[PDB]
C-alpha cells in the first residue's frame, strides 16, 4: 500500500532548492491595528523550520 | 580463445573463436553470489500456510464469565495459548523472487562462462548422435571420451531432438537451450559442452 502524505503539512511547508524546509510565520492574519510596522515586518516572509521540529516535519511531508 | 570442434566417433573438424568480451570477463564472486541467490529464491514455491485465531473453526463466544470463578479470563477457545488454537505470526503463502537488474544477471553469466573457458572446461561438438535415432549408449561413450567428470552441462539447439533424447536420462548430465543459459547451471556443471549451432547462436545473440 502506497504511503500517504499529510494534507495540512503539505499546505503549510515546502522545500527549497537544496532541501531545507521553509514555513510562514503566525500572528499576521488579523488584529493588525495595534501591531507596529516593525512587528509586522518581522513577521513577514518565509523562514526555515527549527532543528527541533525538522524530524517530525520531514516525517509528515514524506 | 580457440577450441576444437569434435565429431562423434570421429576426429576434429573445425575451430571456434571465443570473443574476449564474452569468455574473458573477470570473475566477480559477490555479484555471482547475488545472482545465484536470486535464482534459487525465484525457484521457491512458497506454499506454506497456517490458520490464525480468526480462521480456526469455531471460537466465537466468550467461554465463561470473567469474574467469580478463580480462573484466568480467556476471551475465546481459539486463542493462541490454547491447544488447538491459532498460530501467531505463522507462515503464509509467499512470493520469493527478486528484481536483479539485467546488467548484473548478464555479467554474472558471462563471468561464469569466462571462468569455464579460462580453466579449459568448454567443449564444442557438431552433434551428439550420427543418425536420427537416439542412442544413450553411444552418447554416453562420446561424453566419456570428451570428459571424465561427474557433472556435465550440454547446450544444444531446441530443434535437435535426437541429441536431446540420447543424453536425457544420463545421470550427471543437464540440458538447456542456448538462450536459457544461467549462472547456477554453469557453476554447477564441471564442464560445458556446446553444439556448434548453439555456440554460434549464443555468440551472435550477444554480438
Amino acid at each position: 500500500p502506497k504511503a500517504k502524505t499529510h494534507s495540512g503539512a503539505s499546505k503549510r511547508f515546502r522545500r527549497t532548492g537544496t532541501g531545507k524546509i521553509v514555513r510562514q510565520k503566525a500572528n499576521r492574519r488579523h488584529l493588525l491595528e495595534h501591531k507596529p510596522s516593525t512587528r509586522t515586518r518581522r513577521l513577514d516572509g518565509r523562514t526555515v523550520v527549527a532543528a527541533n521540529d525538522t524530524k517530525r516535519v520531514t516525517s509528515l511531508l514524506n | 580463445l580457440k577450441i576444437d570442434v569434435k565429431t562423434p566417433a570421429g576426429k576434429v573438424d573445425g575451430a571456434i573463436e571465443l570473443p574476449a568480451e564474452l569468455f574473458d570477463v573477470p570473475a566477480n564472486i559477490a555479484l555471482m553470489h547475488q545472482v545465484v541467490t536470486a535464482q534459487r529464491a525465484a525457484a521457491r514455491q512458497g506454499t506454506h500456510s497456517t490458520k490464525t485465531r480468526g480462521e480456526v473453526s469455531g471460537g466465537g463466544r466468550k467461554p465463561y464469565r470473567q469474574k467469580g470463578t478463580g480462573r484466568a479470563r480467556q476471551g475465546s477457545t481459539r486463542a493462541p495459548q490454547f491447544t488447538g488454537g491459532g498460530v501467531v505470526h505463522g507462515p503464509k503463502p509467499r512470493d520469493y523472487s527478486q528484481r536483479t537488474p539485467k546488467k548484473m544477471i548478464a555479467a554474472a553469466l558471462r563471468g561464469a562462462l569466462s571462468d569455464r573457458a579460462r580453466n579449459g572446461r568448454i567443449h564444442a561438438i557438431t552433434e551428439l548422435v550420427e543418425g536420427q535415432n537416439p542412442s544413450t549408449k553411444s552418447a554416453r561413450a562420446f561424453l566419456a571420451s570428451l570428459t571424465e567428470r561427474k557433472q556435465v552441462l550440454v547446450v544444444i539447439g531446441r530443434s535437435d531432438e535426437a541429441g536431446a533424447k540420447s543424453v536425457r536420462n544420463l545421470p550427471g548430465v543437464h540440458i538447456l537451450a542456448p538462450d536459457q543459459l544461467n549462472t547456477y547451471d554453469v557453476l554447477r556443471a564441471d564442464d560445458v559442452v556446446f553444439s556448434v549451432e548453439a555456440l554460434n547462436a549464443y555468440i551472435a545473440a550477444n554480438t
Binding site: 499546505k11 515546502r14 514555513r23 509528515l60 | 571462468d115
Partner: protein
C-alpha cells in the same frame, strides 16, 4: 567455479535482531521498558500531547497553483559546447540522443557557461543571454 565457492561481500549481510529471547539480548520488554502508551501502541506523528500541533498552528502557504503552467526542459550553452565541440546544426532530437534533456518535452536553452563552437541550434523559447552567446560565437538561434 563450484557453487560451494561463492560467498557474499563482507558487510553486505548482517543477522537480524530477535528481540524477545532472554536476558543476554534485548531482554523481556524488547527495548520498550515503559508502562504507558508506548509499551503497547504507537503514538501518531501528528499528535503533540493535546496542544495545537505544528501543522495546525502555522498558516497555510500563500498563493495558488497554475493549472495550465507550461514547463520546459532546460540546457545550458556550456553543456551544448561540451557535447558538441565540433559545432554544426543542433536540434532537440540531438539533445535527447546525447542525453542532456528529457524526451517528448519542450526544450529551452539557457545562457550559463561559455561557448566557443559555432552552432545553429533550434529549440523553443531561448533566453536572452543564450541568444547573445550563440550570435557572438557565430551560430543562429531559431525557434
Amino acid at each position: 567455479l563450484k557453487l560451494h565457492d561463492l560467498r557474499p561481500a563482507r558487510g553486505s549481510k548482517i543477522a537480524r535482531t530477535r528481540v524477545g529471547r532472554g536476558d543476554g539480548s534485548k531482554g523481556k520488554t524488547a527495548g520498550r521498558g515503559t508502562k504507558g502508551t508506548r509499551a503497547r501502541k504507537q503514538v501518531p506523528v501528528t499528535f503533540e500531547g493535546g496542544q495545537m500541533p505544528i501543522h495546525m498552528r502555522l498558516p497555510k502557504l500563500k498563493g495558488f497553483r497554475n493549472r495550465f503552467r507550461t514547463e520546459y526542459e532546460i540546457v545550458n550553452v556550456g553543456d551544448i559546447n561540451r557535447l558538441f565541440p565540433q559545432g554544426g546544426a543542433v536540434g532537440v532530437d540531438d539533445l535527447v540522443a546525447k542525453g542532456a534533456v528529457r524526451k517528448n518535452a519542450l526544450v529551452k536553452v539557457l545562457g550559463d557557461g561559455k561557448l566557443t563552437a559555432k552552432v545553429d541550434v533550434s529549440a523553443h523559447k531561448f533566453s536572452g543571454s543564450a541568444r547573445a552567446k550563440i550570435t557572438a560565437a557565430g551560430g543562429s538561434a531559431t525557434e
